[PDB]
Design a protein around this ligand. Sequence first.
Ligand SMILES: Nc1ncnc2c1ncn2[C@@H]1O[C@H](COP(=O)(O)OP(=O)(O)O)[C@@H](O)[C@H]1O
Lengths: 400, 55, 823
Amino acid sequence: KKTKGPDAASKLPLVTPHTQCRLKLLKLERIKDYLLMEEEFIRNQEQMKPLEEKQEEERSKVDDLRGTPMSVGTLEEIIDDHAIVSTSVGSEHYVSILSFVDKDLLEPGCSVLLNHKVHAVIGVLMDDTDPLVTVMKVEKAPQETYADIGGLDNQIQEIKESVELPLTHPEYYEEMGIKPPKGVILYGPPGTGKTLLAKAVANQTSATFLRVVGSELIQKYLGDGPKLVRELFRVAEEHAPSIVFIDEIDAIGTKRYDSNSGGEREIQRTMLELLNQLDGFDSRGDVKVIMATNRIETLDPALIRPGRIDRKIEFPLPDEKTKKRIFQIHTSRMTLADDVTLDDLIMAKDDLSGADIKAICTEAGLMALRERRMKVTNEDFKKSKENVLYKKQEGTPEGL
Amino acid sequence: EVPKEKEKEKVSTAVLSITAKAKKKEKEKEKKEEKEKKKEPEPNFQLLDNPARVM
Amino acid sequence: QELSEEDKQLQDELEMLVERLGEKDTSLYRPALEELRRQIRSSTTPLKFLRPHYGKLKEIYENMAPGENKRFAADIISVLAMTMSGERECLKYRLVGSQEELASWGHEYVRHLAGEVAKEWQELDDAEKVQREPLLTLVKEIVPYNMAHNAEHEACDLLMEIEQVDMLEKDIDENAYAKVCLYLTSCVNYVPEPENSALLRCALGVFRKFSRFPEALRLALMLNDMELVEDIFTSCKDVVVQKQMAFMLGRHGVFLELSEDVEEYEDLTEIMSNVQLNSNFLALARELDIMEPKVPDDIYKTHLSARMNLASSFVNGFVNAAFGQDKLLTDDGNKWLYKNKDHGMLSAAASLGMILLWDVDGGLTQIDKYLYSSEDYIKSGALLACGIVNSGVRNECDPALALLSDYVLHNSNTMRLGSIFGLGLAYAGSNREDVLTLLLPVMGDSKSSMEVAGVTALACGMIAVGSCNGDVTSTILQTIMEKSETELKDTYARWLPLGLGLNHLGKGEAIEAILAALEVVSEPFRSFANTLVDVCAYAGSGNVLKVQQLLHICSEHFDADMGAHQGVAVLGIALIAMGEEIGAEMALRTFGHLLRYGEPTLRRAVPLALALISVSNPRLNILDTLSKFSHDADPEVSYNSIFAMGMVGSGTNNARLAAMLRQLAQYHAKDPNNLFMVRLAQGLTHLGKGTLTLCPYHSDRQLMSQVAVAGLLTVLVSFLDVRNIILGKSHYVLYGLVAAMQPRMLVTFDEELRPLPVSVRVGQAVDVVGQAGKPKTITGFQTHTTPVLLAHGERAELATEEFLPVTPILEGFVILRKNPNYD
Ligand SMILES: Nc1ncnc2c1ncn2[C@@H]1O[C@H](COP(=O)(O)OP(=O)(O)O)[C@@H](O)[C@H]1O
């Protein structure tokens, strides 16, 4: 019922300075002038019409036969000449449309019009705007790019190779006749994991993306957690081949829980449906499933096997240079200071992750805005360290 | 008896900011590079032949 | 509201002070303001308290006796006006003020002062040049402050607002000049022409001062001033800068004609002539193992006819272009052309020359046998093959001129056509007086057909591109006048305006004289010709005014059918501002609305502009939109969409796009008209094995090479109406891609000019930090040996600080020298 959405927005995010300067001013003037010229173009084309030809052949033949009164009902079945439509209050009509028929946009389970009196379909509402049962493609192909995250070059190269084995050079193993949808099993500290998302946006630069986080220990009798994701990756194959990011459910939803029976039925269903979908002998498609976790220990032996789920990748903690790069990225938007106090905040620091880096950057601006408002607050040199302590790392009575 | 009709369908250009800045430069270059017959004489002093529809 | 206790106490204290300063007797006026100003200029290194005292402070400042008291009073009014500004009261008070050292009153004050100075400098009339000097002195005081406190980019903003980039040169030091110049270059893309040339000239001035000649040549090429290019080439003297200049001219394709008095002149003219281009390109292709001749059949994936075989030959030539290694047309080539039917032998031989392009020695010997062929089409194709071979690459003895001796003006139409097109491709950008004086008389011939005259105009335009050749234009106009209008405006006179546009490419302004001379022409062809020459001359400028004129004219009904010039307006829409990413992707969106609600001619021409925007750049949205519109009802619209996909994927080897074209081939297997050009699109995608890109934007994708865009535009002008012309005869116009076909890999030499195996890090290079004019940041270091295919979005960077390049721009050719700290 959903194929694509009109992407006529996000007007050139590449504003090079992202700070108020003449160059950025001039880029915006070119942006606005083009908007003015495009609007003037379309308005002049629609107003200074190519030709006046009667009632555009609309009101003469089709509009009158469509009629004034109408009602909307879903279209159920298709037959060679007629069409089988399930209208409101459970009515069912077998009529051939010939006025304003667009068979491609008609489709089963879509809203069509009924002209009353002689109830015959006369049109279709392609908008409809109610495909809301299971919605996971709403966040498809996220705009985040490689440049958003730095200092992770080894992992970026590894994931890029693992996901550019398809798309790029598919004939490579098409000739090798394997077509492996191995996916990637991602490790990493609990202080990260939404980077398991950030490193995923590198592949999200191509095709769409689906996310299943937390899901459930599929107590549902039908199960169909992984099975519905199988249907959605089939939908992804219908679309541009998407990836499935199941961070934290490859861990909990697929736990190496070591009891055998009487175990919430996910061990029976979820793990067994995961390896069926992860085996290329059952389902085709360029879909690559990114299984990311923060507990490598709970890797189920089915998930452990690289024979079906290959391309194990470990996410380590950032190094000194990586900490410098991520701090530079996060403070670039805020113009931390003119003294550039960069290395003092990370030189003695250890076990600091991306979420902590983002938090301390945000809190540095918050503390400055609190009362120390001084644009590039001269206090920021040490207040960045003041809010990098911020306690809140870990707290547990004494036991020492 | 005379319509005095005009079909324009003309809308003015909405040049606003930098096009208008060039227009200011265009201003910089462009700076150098029936009463006597209507007051008294209404046509009421005419002569008419003997066939004349007059109330 | 309850404020802070100490804050309220200080507020009351300042209230008492301002009341004292507002008292009647002035004997206490001075001490009150002495006390006040010290804490006024305290927080900047307060202003909240004096918010409601605007009128009282204005009265005190006006009432202050002239002298010290008045000018401190004007000082305080100025530093407070940054908050209480209904106008530039800060600057009016400061002009009345002391004009002593201002920079100590806080960074916020000096920057508000700088902005207000820029406003007044723009506001003051021409007759007012009294206060301009004090504002300039204030500017020359704040620029060092900006340089010290990393505010050089807004310092550049105010200096360009006041048109004082000349003293920007003298003030800027090299320690921060690189980012300032990058900021200038970025502003160049959007500034209109007069200040655009001004910023280009100042950028040349900075780089000449700081001995930054390699990037200065890049900027000179942007300025398209060959005189300044020669001047700066003379200015630089070192052997390393001399030889990198010669690479840059050779990579651009324009030959610089100089004297042998310079050192190592033989190598300089050789590397400018691209003699070693072919040898290096084959050597790198062998090193990548990408040399095997890829069959058009297994490109087609035939696991599941004369024109179709012709398309197969053309795509085979596209794939094996610049290689010269293809036995399909070499061993049994004579059998293939004999088996070929009708008009295609000329194109098959030209395709063989495409295989042998840039291969002068090998190509000439392997085409000499086919030169003496029996069929006129094969002979003409062989001559065109010779011109393709010598195209782009320059030669000392220039064999093309002597080889095309009788065929240049030969009576046979096909033989003359092949020679003329060959000479045009050869002398493209040479601007040679002898070639011009030999081909323009051929232009003046009356026995040649209308399309032959058009091809002569095309050859003259591509030879004299961006030269404003007056005699070429006069001959063009005279030939148009002599030809009768009725037979002029049929289907083929569309090459004469193209030659005019090429000859005045990138110049503008003077086009008024050409269009005024052309005004005598009747509307159906004049309205097309003047628009074409205008958009070609103003290409790469971003003229929103010109494009909205094109938008207005294509908005007309135009329904003998003069509405053809709506198409060239569509091409002009993309052509004017294809330079940077902005101006191309909203132009793309404009094309989408054109297709969304547009005339049949408009939607016929839109895919051409779509391909022009992003040739050789496989943008996902472009590929999707073109694929969705490839199945439109209008056959010509489908043809343009097919070719647009081929062009945007040209020289990319994009696997998913190739799969889409294969699906299109299955879709269009029933109709050969779409089928053979879908094959053509696939051959374009795999052209040169993807080694040579087709985008005319080189030198970090920001320089317009006139010859390449000339050949590309000629192809798109042909593809305005291929529904008539490719079906009929124009199987030769497709060979204009030689100009746009340039390699996109890195060839590293050394000071002794030997191929270095130095490895570099290659990956996506997009802006991360925009705080200033920082260099573009690269991510994804997939480092390997130096032959690396440079596509859009991604750049290259040296792996280590061990080999210093002649220029930081890393594409095409580059010399790497050992760093003094290399160890
Ligand atoms: N190395 C990095 N560079 C840039 N941004 C990062 C980096 N690491 C994390 N981030 C950003 O910080 C956010 C939190 O990252 P992460 O540590 O993955 O979250 P969590 O710890 O909640 O899983 C992410 O959304 C990501 O965009």
